[PDB]
Enzyme design. Structure first.
Site, PDB file in Angstrom:
ATOM      1  N   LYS A  52       0.819  -1.241   0.000  1.00  0.00           N
ATOM      2  CA  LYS A  52       0.000   0.000   0.000  1.00  0.00           C
ATOM      3  C   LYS A  52       0.828   1.255   0.000  1.00  0.00           C
ATOM      4  O   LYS A  52       0.489   2.327  -0.536  1.00  0.00           O
ATOM      5  CB  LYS A  52      -0.888   0.031   1.206  1.00  0.00           C
ATOM      6  CG  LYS A  52      -2.036   0.951   0.947  1.00  0.00           C
ATOM      7  CD  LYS A  52      -3.101   0.842   1.993  1.00  0.00           C
ATOM      8  CE  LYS A  52      -4.214   1.808   1.670  1.00  0.00           C
ATOM      9  NZ  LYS A  52      -3.725   3.185   1.514  1.00  0.00           N
ATOM     10  N   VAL A  57      -0.943   1.849  -5.153  1.00  0.00           N
ATOM     11  CA  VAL A  57      -1.469   1.044  -4.132  1.00  0.00           C
ATOM     12  C   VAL A  57      -2.476   1.536  -3.125  1.00  0.00           C
ATOM     13  O   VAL A  57      -2.162   2.066  -2.095  1.00  0.00           O
ATOM     14  CB  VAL A  57      -0.527  -0.006  -3.698  1.00  0.00           C
ATOM     15  CG1 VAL A  57      -1.393  -1.134  -3.175  1.00  0.00           C
ATOM     16  CG2 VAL A  57       0.185  -0.375  -5.001  1.00  0.00           C
ATOM     17  N   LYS A  64      -6.745  -7.120  -0.977  1.00  0.00           N
ATOM     18  CA  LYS A  64      -6.697  -8.337  -1.761  1.00  0.00           C
ATOM     19  C   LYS A  64      -5.352  -9.016  -1.615  1.00  0.00           C
ATOM     20  O   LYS A  64      -5.245 -10.218  -1.581  1.00  0.00           O
ATOM     21  CB  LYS A  64      -7.083  -8.129  -3.224  1.00  0.00           C
ATOM     22  CG  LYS A  64      -8.566  -8.329  -3.489  1.00  0.00           C
ATOM     23  CD  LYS A  64      -9.229  -7.162  -4.227  1.00  0.00           C
ATOM     24  CE  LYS A  64      -9.947  -6.199  -3.280  1.00  0.00           C
ATOM     25  NZ  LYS A  64     -10.876  -5.321  -3.972  1.00  0.00           N
ATOM     26  N   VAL A  95     -12.520 -15.439 -30.726  1.00  0.00           N
ATOM     27  CA  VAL A  95     -12.888 -15.394 -32.107  1.00  0.00           C
ATOM     28  C   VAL A  95     -12.424 -14.149 -32.753  1.00  0.00           C
ATOM     29  O   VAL A  95     -12.727 -13.073 -32.287  1.00  0.00           O
ATOM     30  CB  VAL A  95     -14.380 -15.497 -32.323  1.00  0.00           C
ATOM     31  CG1 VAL A  95     -14.712 -15.182 -33.799  1.00  0.00           C
ATOM     32  CG2 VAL A  95     -14.857 -16.901 -31.934  1.00  0.00           C
ATOM     33  N   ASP A 182       1.332 -15.000 -37.232  1.00  0.00           N
ATOM     34  CA  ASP A 182       0.757 -14.636 -38.520  1.00  0.00           C
ATOM     35  C   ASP A 182       1.814 -14.080 -39.445  1.00  0.00           C
ATOM     36  O   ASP A 182       2.963 -13.854 -39.044  1.00  0.00           O
ATOM     37  CB  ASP A 182      -0.241 -13.521 -38.237  1.00  0.00           C
ATOM     38  CG  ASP A 182       0.472 -12.463 -37.437  1.00  0.00           C
ATOM     39  OD1 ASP A 182       1.645 -12.545 -37.122  1.00  0.00           O
ATOM     40  OD2 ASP A 182      -0.274 -11.444 -37.125  1.00  0.00           O
TER      41      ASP A 182
HETATM   42 NA    NA Z   1     -10.908 -12.022 -30.763  1.00  0.00          NA
END
Ligand code: NA
Ligand code: NA
Length: 327
Positions: A52, A57, A64, A95, A182
């Site tokens: 913190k 922070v 958490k 997708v 790619d």
């Molecule tokens: Na996507």
DNA sequence: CATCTG
DNA sequence: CAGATG
């Protein structure tokens, strides 16, 4: 790098969710700087309170970390990893062309599966559609074995259409990578630069060829400078056909090629470091050029490039073969 | 950032 | 045109 691992990781898990599930750009954006700071952080955080103390922070995050620190888990993270709703977003998104925004609309409409999808192909644009038709093919990596065949194909075409073209497949491919995601080609032409008022045909003419010869199987988006689409290596003596791959072709003015070509080659690390030093040497870089840096703070004026070699020189450096451009 | 959708 | 995707 390994001392504040779980923390950064959980942080990152969370951030992700805010952005993808929740529209939570702010929150999202928050987990990210924290995750970033504890990361650089030289110490072994032993508590929230400890953490913190950090910029980025807040208390929330501190809380958490505490729970986590305490228990090898986090309930909220636990709740999320279940929620078929949260899950269905992560999935959909995969997708191509499905973004998160959509990932939600789709879910709310009750589409949560690949099946769900085909089912409702109608409600999906061409990108999405292509994106679903080759879901499998698109996740598959690209062996350099196929890369080189690919490359060789492109190059042979472009040369054929105009002796004057200058194509370059960038990426990790370019850096030596055994496999790639790619195909990325850098495009140029003498007849096209900075001022030079266009020549669209310049990009099309080639797009055309590839389809002529059938390499480019589909188009995703095609503009006058950047094309986004599909390819595929011809299947030999029928028994083993290739999978479909993503490829991208883009027109670059002959006057900022190498800068692009250098740039796109990566790795990201080699870039900044190159850049940071470029800075020292009294210069600046970006995707397009190298400008002599004034002292007044800043200044520009595109220093002339004719190879990635010119750039090295400018900032007086060791020309690196793409191979070692790792870091 | 450049393209698409609607 | 805003807004979304890559
Ligand atoms: Na996507
Ligand atoms: Na707005």
């Amino acid at each position: 790098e390994t001392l504040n691992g779980g923390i950064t990781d959980m942080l990152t898990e969370l951030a992700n969710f805010e952005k993808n599930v929740s529209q939570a750009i702010h929150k999202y954006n928050a987990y990210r700087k924290a995750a970033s700071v504890i990361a650089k952080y030289p110490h072994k955080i032993k508590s929230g309170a400890e953490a913190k103390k950090l910029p980025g922070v807040g208390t929330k995050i501190a809380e958490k970390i505490d729970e986590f620190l305490a228990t090898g888990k986090l309930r909220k993270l636990e709740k999320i990893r279940q929620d078929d709703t949260s899950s269905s977003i992560n999935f959909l998104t995969r997708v191509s062309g499905i973004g998160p925004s959509a990932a939600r609309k789709f879910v709310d409409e009750g589409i949560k599966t690949l099946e769900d999808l085909r089912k409702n192909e109608d409600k999906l644009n061409h990108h999405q559609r292509i994106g679903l038709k080759y879901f499998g093919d698109f996740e598959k990596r690209i062996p350099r074995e196929e890369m080189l065949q690919m490359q060789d194909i492109v190059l042979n075409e472009v040369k054929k259409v105009d002796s004057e073209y200058i194509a370059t497949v960038c990426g990790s491919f370019r850096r030596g990578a055994e496999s790639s995601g790619d195909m990325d080609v850098l495009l140029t032409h003498p007849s096209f630069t900075s001022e030079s008022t266009k020549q669209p045909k310049l990009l099309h003419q080639v797009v055309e060829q590839l389809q002529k010869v059938h390499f480019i199987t589909d188009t995703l988006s095609k503009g006058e400078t950047k094309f986004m689409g599909v390819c595929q290596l011809p299947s030999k003596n029928d028994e083993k056909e290739y999978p479909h791959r993503r490829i991208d072709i883009r027109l670059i003015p002959k006057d900022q090629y190498y800068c692009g070509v250098l740039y796109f080659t990566g790795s990201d690390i080699f870039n900044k470091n190159m850049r940071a030093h470029a800075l020292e040497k009294g210069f600046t870089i970006n995707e397009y050029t190298i400008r002599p840096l004034g002292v007044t703070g800043v200044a520009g004026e595109p220093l002339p490039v004719d190879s990635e070699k010119d750039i090295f020189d400018y900032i007086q450096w060791k020309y690196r073969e793409p191979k070692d451009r790792s870091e």
